Ligand binder design. Structure first.
Ligand SMILES: CCCCNS(=O)(=O)c1ccccc1
Length: 117
């Protein structure tokens, strides 16, 4: 990955909170990173939780595309922008399910783009 060790420091406090709130295990996170994701609230609500902590989504899981693209390396932004044209706006039954659907769409469309810390 292009994700540097810094980001792990930066997200540590929110990561710990989000996992505690939702019953998330590190194994579930590792799985999403390997492209294995199911619609289980303990992982889908974790992803919403962390996105929200960094202002990447609002109260109804609408994505701030400019902030999201801003997370990614310059060299990935062209292809990520195409992916967001396909996968946004979000849709689903609740905030966690919206992020499930988004993650599945990004992972299906682009290898290097969705990542979960
Ligand atoms: C392309 C967006 C990735 C979303 N993954 S994440 O929810 O773990 C997350 C990563 C980094 C900051 C906040 C949330």
């Amino acid at each position: 990955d292009w994700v540097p060790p810094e980001v792990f420091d930066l997200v540590a406090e929110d990561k710990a909170r989000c996992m505690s709130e939702h019953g998330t295990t590190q194994a579930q996170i590792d799985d999403v990173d390997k492209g294995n994701l199911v619609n289980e609230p303990s992982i889908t609500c974790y992803m919403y939780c962390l996105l929200e902590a960094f202002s990447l989504v609002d109260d109804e899981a609408n994505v701030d595309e400019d902030i999201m693209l801003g997370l990614l390396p310059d060299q990935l932004q062209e292809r990520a922008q195409s992916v967001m044209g396909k996968c946004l706006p979000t849709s689903g039954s609740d905030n966690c399910n919206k992020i499930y659907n988004l993650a599945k769409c990004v992972q299906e469309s682009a290898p290097d783009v969705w990542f979960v810390i």
